[PDB]
């Protein structure tokens with residue numbers, strides 16, 4: 001078991017050029033593969049989730065080339081649905097943005113493909129998506145536990161009236177939205193009730209528009225899609241920097257700055273996690289907005305009590321930043337933390353208590369009362385990139401912290417610790 005020990009960081013200050021957005025990167029790659037023409041993506045993220053998507057596209061027959069640093073990709077569009085037979089297995093690692101979107105897209109036409117991944121992926125739900133795809137005509141088989149990967153897809157999604165549950169993940173609706181335009185018949189997608197992580201649907205619709213497709217969004221309760229469409233290459237496309245990855249560095253400044261500026265995202269970004277900056281401002285930090293940067297300067301840090309459903313991933317960063325705030329912080333309406341890279345409510349509460357906090361682990365919320373002073377802990381990371389990045393902030397105090405399995409950050413940010421060190425100052 002590898003580990004990394006972070007010594008106390010006296011102050012943070014500096015500029016970080018953000019790695020590419022994982023959410024945008026995987027959507028752009030799949031749309032480029034389905035599109036007609038050559039797409040040149042720049043500022044593409046090089047991480048495990050993107051590598052698994054690229055490997056899947058290679059296995060499906062898509063041609064592309066990558067630059068030396070793997071941030072520039074020239075993709076040759078397939079000009080329509082991707083195809084493979086013989087129960088070809090695509091191993092998708094831990095990537096939800098490959099698993100959910102491909103589970104839907106590969107249901108177009110006739111195929112015989114199996115989707116699987118790491119053990120944890122076999123524990124992340126996909127039943128709501130499968131239910132919707134079947135209503136549209138798809139033939140899908142669960143090879144292990146019902147409602148979870150791995151899946152054998154045999155095609156048949158033609159469109160029609162499809163209902164989808166949006167209460168657990170926005171990725172199921174995202175997958176349907178990307179797939180429906182290419183189906184032969186028109187599709188009306190009806191949301192059964194609530195829709196969580198709503199800002200990610202805006203990311204999906206933005207990418208679809210870039211690739212030539214628009215749909216009718218009726219107040220996020222129903223989406224009307226015309227079938228028989230085709231995606232078209234936009235030529236060159238610049239991938240936004242990752243706003244979720246930015247959260248760690250902006251929070252670092254709110255706690256121990258200094259001023260930290262992140263470039264690659266700004267006030268015009270399509271990512272919902274830029275709203276993380278507004279939470280730091282509510283806590284007492286100073287935020288500066290630019291067209292291609294967001295910066296945070298240390299002010300003060302006061303506890304908050306907020307519904308975080310609109311920024312579930314960046315909300316985890318507030319949970320460790322809360323260790324440094326005045327008062328008790330409560331983060332609400334975050335049930336799906338339980339079904340991601342690990343059960344994050346269980347994990348976050350467990351590890352926060354290890355450094356001294358008093359924590360109430362609610363079914364769908366977490367309440368955190370910081371200790372007078374933090375203590376040392378060897379932090380378990382649950383094969384979850386965000387547990388490692390969130391707990392790295394413990395070192396912005398008088399105590400060191402040891403992070404187990406630091407390489408798990410590679411899901412979205414292989415160079416995380418090098419970047420945190422770049423802004424760490426001794427004076």
Ligand SMILES: O=C(O)C1=C[C@@H](OP(=O)(O)O)[C@@H](O)[C@H](O[C@@](OP(=O)(O)O)(C(=O)O)C(F)F)C1
Nearest residue numbers: 023094095096097169170171197200313340341
């Ligand atoms: O559509 C997207 O791009 C995502 C939407 C969210 O999921 P929900 O709609 O289910 O709330 C994020 O939490 C998810 O990021 C994570 O990763 P995956 O891409 O799903 O593997 C993450 O980086 O931590 C997370 F869900 F674990 C990526």
